Amino acid sequence: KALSAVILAAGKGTRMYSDLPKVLHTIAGKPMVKHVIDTAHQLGSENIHLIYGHGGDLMRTHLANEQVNWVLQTEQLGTAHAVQQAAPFFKDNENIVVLYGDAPLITKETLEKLIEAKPENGIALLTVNLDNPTGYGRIIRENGNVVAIVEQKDANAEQLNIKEVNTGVMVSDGASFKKWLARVGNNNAQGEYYLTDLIALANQDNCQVVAVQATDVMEVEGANNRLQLAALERYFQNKQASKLLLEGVMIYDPARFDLRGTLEHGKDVEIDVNVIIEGNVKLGDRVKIGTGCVLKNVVIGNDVEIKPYSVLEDSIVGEKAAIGPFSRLRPGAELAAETHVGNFVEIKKSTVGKGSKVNHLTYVGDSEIGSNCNIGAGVITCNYDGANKFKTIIGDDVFVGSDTQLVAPVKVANGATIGAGTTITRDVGENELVITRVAQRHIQGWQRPI
Amino acid sequence: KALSAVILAAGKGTRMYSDLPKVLHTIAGKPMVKHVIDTAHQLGSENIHLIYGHGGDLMRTHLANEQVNWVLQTEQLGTAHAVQQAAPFFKDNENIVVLYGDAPLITKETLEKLIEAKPENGIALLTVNLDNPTGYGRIIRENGNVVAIVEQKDANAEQLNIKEVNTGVMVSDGASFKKWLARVGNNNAQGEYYLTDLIALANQDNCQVVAVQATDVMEVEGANNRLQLAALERYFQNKQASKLLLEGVMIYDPARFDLRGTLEHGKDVEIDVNVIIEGNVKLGDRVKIGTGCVLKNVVIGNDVEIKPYSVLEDSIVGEKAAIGPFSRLRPGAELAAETHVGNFVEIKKSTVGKGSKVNHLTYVGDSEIGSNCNIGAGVITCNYDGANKFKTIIGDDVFVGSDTQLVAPVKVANGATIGAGTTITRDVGENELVITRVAQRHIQGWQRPI
Amino acid sequence: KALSAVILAAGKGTRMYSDLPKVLHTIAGKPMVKHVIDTAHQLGSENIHLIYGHGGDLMRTHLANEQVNWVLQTEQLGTAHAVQQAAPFFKDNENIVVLYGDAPLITKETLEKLIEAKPENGIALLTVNLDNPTGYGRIIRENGNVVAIVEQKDANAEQLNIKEVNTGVMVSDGASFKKWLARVGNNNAQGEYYLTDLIALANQDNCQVVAVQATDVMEVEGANNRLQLAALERYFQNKQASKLLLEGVMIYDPARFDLRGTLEHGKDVEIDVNVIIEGNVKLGDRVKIGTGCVLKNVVIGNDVEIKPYSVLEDSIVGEKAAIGPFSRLRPGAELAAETHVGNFVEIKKSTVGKGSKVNHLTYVGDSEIGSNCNIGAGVITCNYDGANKFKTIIGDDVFVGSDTQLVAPVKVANGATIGAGTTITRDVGENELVITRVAQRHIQGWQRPI
Numbered sequence A, B, C: 001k002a003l004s005a006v007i008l009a010a011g012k013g014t015r016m017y018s019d020l021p022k023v024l025h026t027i028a029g030k031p032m033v034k035h036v037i038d039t040a041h042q043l044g045s046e047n048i049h050l051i052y053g054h055g056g057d058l059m060r061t062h063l064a065n066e067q068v069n070w071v072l073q074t075e076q077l078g079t080a081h082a083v084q085q086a087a088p089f090f091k092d093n094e095n096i097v098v099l100y101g102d103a104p105l106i107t108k109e110t111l112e113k114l115i116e117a118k119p120e121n122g123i124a125l126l127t128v129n130l131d132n133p134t135g136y137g138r139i140i141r142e143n144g145n146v147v148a149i150v151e152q153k154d155a156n157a158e159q160l161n162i163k164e165v166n167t168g169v170m171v172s173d174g175a176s177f178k179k180w181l182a183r184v185g186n187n188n189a190q191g192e193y194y195l196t197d198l199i200a201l202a203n204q205d206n207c208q209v210v211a212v213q214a215t216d217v218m219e220v221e222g223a224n225n226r227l228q229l230a231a232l233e234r235y236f237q238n239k240q241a242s243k244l245l246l247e248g249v250m251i252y253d254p255a256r257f258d259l260r261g262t263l264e265h266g267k268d269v270e271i272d273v274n275v276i277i278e279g280n281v282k283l284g285d286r287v288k289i290g291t292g293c294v295l296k297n298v299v300i301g302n303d304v305e306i307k308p309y310s311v312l313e314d315s316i317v318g319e320k321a322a323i324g325p326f327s328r329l330r331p332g333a334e335l336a337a338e339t340h341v342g343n344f345v346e347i348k349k350s351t352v353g354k355g356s357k358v359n360h361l362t363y364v365g366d367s368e369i370g371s372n373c374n375i376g377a378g379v380i381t382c383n384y385d386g387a388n389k390f391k392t393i394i395g396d397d398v399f400v401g402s403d404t405q406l407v408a409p410v411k412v413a414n415g416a417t418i419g420a421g422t423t424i425t426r427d428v429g430e431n432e433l434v435i436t437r438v439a440q441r442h443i444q445g446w447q448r449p450i
């Protein structure tokens, strides 16, 4: 049968001490709630009902593009009251999974096992074993089925030793949710309508409640502060790195590796310590990444070596190219195959042709460089004052001498040669040699003040 | 009643294999003994008696500014002999706390609980539970009070299983210290006068010895080598990062964060992995720090973003400024609000006015730059040979073309425009345009040697 | 008696998902098998028989210089079949130790204890205790001697609780290996000739099998995938850092330190977080290394400070020199005593004389710089097009003004002074002052387009 998801995300998150609502704080560069919405989407949810309240405006701006049904809960009357806000949109013959925006590491595989175990007209309750279950609702099984969730304050000596506890995550059909939520009361110390009470209501109706144990505790762990958030981040990062290592990526130290998006990789990829991968990154075969690199939204061809402390963003690098150390690729940098980018070099919105080298103390911006060019140390592409970034065009096999200024708009045709310390403001012809005529004063017997 | 502290710091620290005495090795950029002196100061100690011996000269130069009473112990005759060196300066009606220069993580909160529990004319002994208490003096309690500290070699089978052990940290009044220290003998295998013996002496006098358990084992842990020192450092760093995370600082990875001084922060501050904070650092609201940054004695206004691999020292940064990646702020760098400092840029002892940009491959030293200036790539402020760093003055709304040399002493007035590749040695007037007249040799049909 | 070693290294290593055979994947910059060959060499092995099969060509190219006897096993018929391939080369009266190319952390000290315990005409079997010994061959001792290795599938309830397990590492004389290997059968579920069977064969001959327990489990741990390889790497790195810390090296964080070769050090050396040491590195006394540095095949004299994010390779640095932050030393960089190399500076195959400073945005390549020179910001050594890296010679006490281009081949004699923004193509005489005569157009009342 069909499936829809409900995500609780109305929490203030007071203990984060932030202007952001609780669920917008990120895990691996992504808001906590976005992990949940994506997991719900990978399950095949027709609808994803997002229960929101605190920081409504911020939720809407940060999650504007999410395919969710925005359900405002004006008052936090309890988790059952929150689910009931979305209940008029539940299809009677569809399954509904209840998730929490601040417990983001819940897996598609655990939820699939939970949905699968759900008995007809009953509930599938997600449970977990804790070494210290103190404070949590103990799961009581009788004839294999969950008969009660016994709270810490109510449990007897024997029940206190039960390690299996309630996570709040559950699956039931829409009609059963509509029916039971209308029957939840708030007669307890907190005066709240608890979704927990649906287990007692199911048993009252002689409907079966089946327990499904989660793989890891960290999957159901919520973050109430930035310390807990950091623990979720380390667990998530270690999980991503282990999957990569088992896929054949040589990550020198999985404890000093960060993936904040997606990684597509070839075989024999080597990633040194303190590397950060952001957005959508694709590495070809035998790519080597040196210590301290940051790759954001990049495409790296086969056999590329990125030497230490290189920062690349919205760039493309061709096969056998050599980058770094200390290279900066800014958005629009397109390096063809067998290119060379060295230390203290900045490339921005420029194309660099096959075999070309830009190895030292250079700025290349809004330029087109052909194949087999030699861009000398200290070369800078610049503009006139009041200009609107006008473009530098360099053809094939051009030599640009050290410390030359290329003043855009300007073209340098194939095979041209530019001498060191030149100011290029006018177009250079095919095979034109341009050298600066220097005037110098020479004074003999100049005794230095030493 | 009043309080004074005694700190034992006469140890050679042979196993550190250093020319430094034991207590001068640092934890979080601060000598071990300095943590103890600061803790003693935060308690409200009138006097802090520093027992020193080994590396006396080095102790005096490294701790010249400390408000302590320098007490030389010429021979290490034991911990009781060391305390007795300071005993003539103990006030009879003041409390005395005994601390160790090589056990630096002892907290003010633990010591406050220790002082509070001290019975009149008695001792408050600091204790700790160990999973493996092997080698340590077992605490024997009878009617709630400490009757003996039983050494490993003397303990019976039942006593060997006692997990509560002696830390050496204790509080008593000055008159009781004077009285008991004069009664300590050295009749034992080591021939030393042990401060431990004061517990047996207190009981002999029918004075009460009360045990106070420490929060963590690491608080009372001593460092005898650099491996143990490193373990204290990791524990201390993790403790600082957790406090920050609970205060609302987003530290991406607390295991890759280092605070070596003090941090003052606003709300919604984000600190990426491998960031080092040194000296006195103040961050405004929503400051973002990219991976690999080093901030030493800096003030950062609200909404500043520091991009990866930026190194800042003795600098001030105004609100909404953008720094890095690969920026270097040296002492005296003052960036006004909404400024821009980019890759491979070095700023030293210079002021940079509101909205001004210095985005590439530039050195700015001993300069004053006004508001809304554009400092082109490759611009360098320099001096003549034999000069004494003479100062560059740039007014408001100045354009400085790429690869220009500003030869100090020199002034460039408001609205001036300097063309690329210029050598400025003479003052530039308000709205003066200065461009280089270039001479070039152009040779057609120059076939490159390829 | 004499000793020879046999190393099993014929494995495909399918779960690494690599084009490399299993044993060539590195630990601390060295192939797994190379650690084993080096350990075997430090024991005093006359011969090291390398059993190889999978990726034969790659094994031979990567280990071309190893003093081993290359033994091809065309089919993996079992570990006993592999050892038997080398058995015709075993001396009857020499000891033979059996090692595994994919279990690289085995120590010389453990193997020495194993050889020592070997009874005449018997076997010394290396064993280890596991908390969970599930799947491993349980060691059965009777009268102190190993009577059987009981496999998981065969063990009774009582035997399943035995924590002591077989590692596969063993020592026996050559004649006993020849005799027993010829008697190993393949009658088991896998149809393989197991070296394990030699224990049962030894007992059949009334020869004694003595168990020797390894120091750590990690010493005998094999790597079947890159995740396991990463765990071996972390254990190895932590082991190297602890030895260094106990030797007196101040490593700020041993969890963020990497040694991939050898380190020779003086006293009071300080190494900050995220430092990588590669090849053969020698540090003098009181060397300080800032965060993020990479030192490969370097020699660093006493009292040198390397400031953050500096990358050095095949270089020599004299005493009291100051390097970084953001410095790049490329192969052949030789810095004399009391030199200064600053941010965004690249030195390649050049000598830099005593007291000389190269502090900003500079490239120095194929140069000889004398003593007490001042190399201004933006200075670049370059060549003509079609040149073959021709060399720049700078004498003593030379001032080179900011943004000067030194066009090789060229000499600048003692005491010469070069003004800022100069192009040097011709030799400069002793005490010659060379300054650029500039031509400039000055336009008054130039209103900027703002």
Ligand SMILES: COc1cc(C(=O)Nc2ccc(NC(=O)c3ccccn3)cc2)cc(-c2c[nH]c(=O)[nH]c2=O)c1
Residues within 6 Å of the ligand: A008, A009, A010, A011, A012, A022, A023, A051, A073, A075, A076, A077, A078, A079, A081, A082, A100, A101, A102, A103, A128, A136, A165, A166, A167, A168, A217, A220, A221, A222, A223
């Ligand atoms: C952040 O938005 C919300 C979150 C939650 C919530 O209860 N989240 C949550 C649930 C369970 C766990 N689980 C664990 O941490 C756990 C469980 C078992 C073992 C170990 N750990 C964590 C977070 C409830 C409401 C919400 C409440 N009340 C209302 O009225 N409206 C709402 O939206 C809102």
Ligand SMILES: COc1cc(C(=O)Nc2ccc(NC(=O)c3ccccn3)cc2)cc(-c2c[nH]c(=O)[nH]c2=O)c1
Residues within 6 Å of the ligand: B008, B009, B010, B011, B012, B022, B023, B051, B073, B075, B076, B077, B078, B079, B081, B082, B100, B101, B102, B103, B128, B136, B165, B166, B167, B168, B217, B220, B221, B222, B223
């Ligand atoms: C470094 O200067 C000194 C230090 C100490 C000293 O004993 N320090 C110390 C004391 C206790 C601990 N505690 C633990 O490590 C511990 C305790 C319980 C559980 C776990 N860990 C550590 C260091 C004693 C003298 C000194 C000695 N003798 C003299 O004659 N003069 C002196 O100054 C000098």
Ligand SMILES: COc1cc(C(=O)Nc2ccc(NC(=O)c3ccccn3)cc2)cc(-c2c[nH]c(=O)[nH]c2=O)c1
Residues within 6 Å of the ligand: C008, C009, C010, C011, C012, C022, C023, C051, C073, C075, C076, C077, C078, C079, C081, C082, C100, C101, C102, C103, C128, C136, C165, C166, C167, C168, C217, C220, C221, C222, C223
């Ligand atoms: C990689 O090359 C090989 C390796 C091995 C091999 O068996 N290696 C190995 C042996 C023991 C362990 N030990 C553990 O992991 C361990 C043990 C006890 C406790 C904990 N861990 C690890 C690796 C065998 C052959 C090889 C096999 N068969 C053939 O026919 N030819 C060969 O070369 C080849």
Ligand SMILES: [Mg+2]
Residues within 6 Å of the ligand: A378, A403, B378, B403, C378, C403
């Ligand atoms: Mg320049």
Ligand SMILES: [Mg+2]
Residues within 6 Å of the ligand: A403, A421, B403, B421, C403, C421
């Ligand atoms: Mg120039």
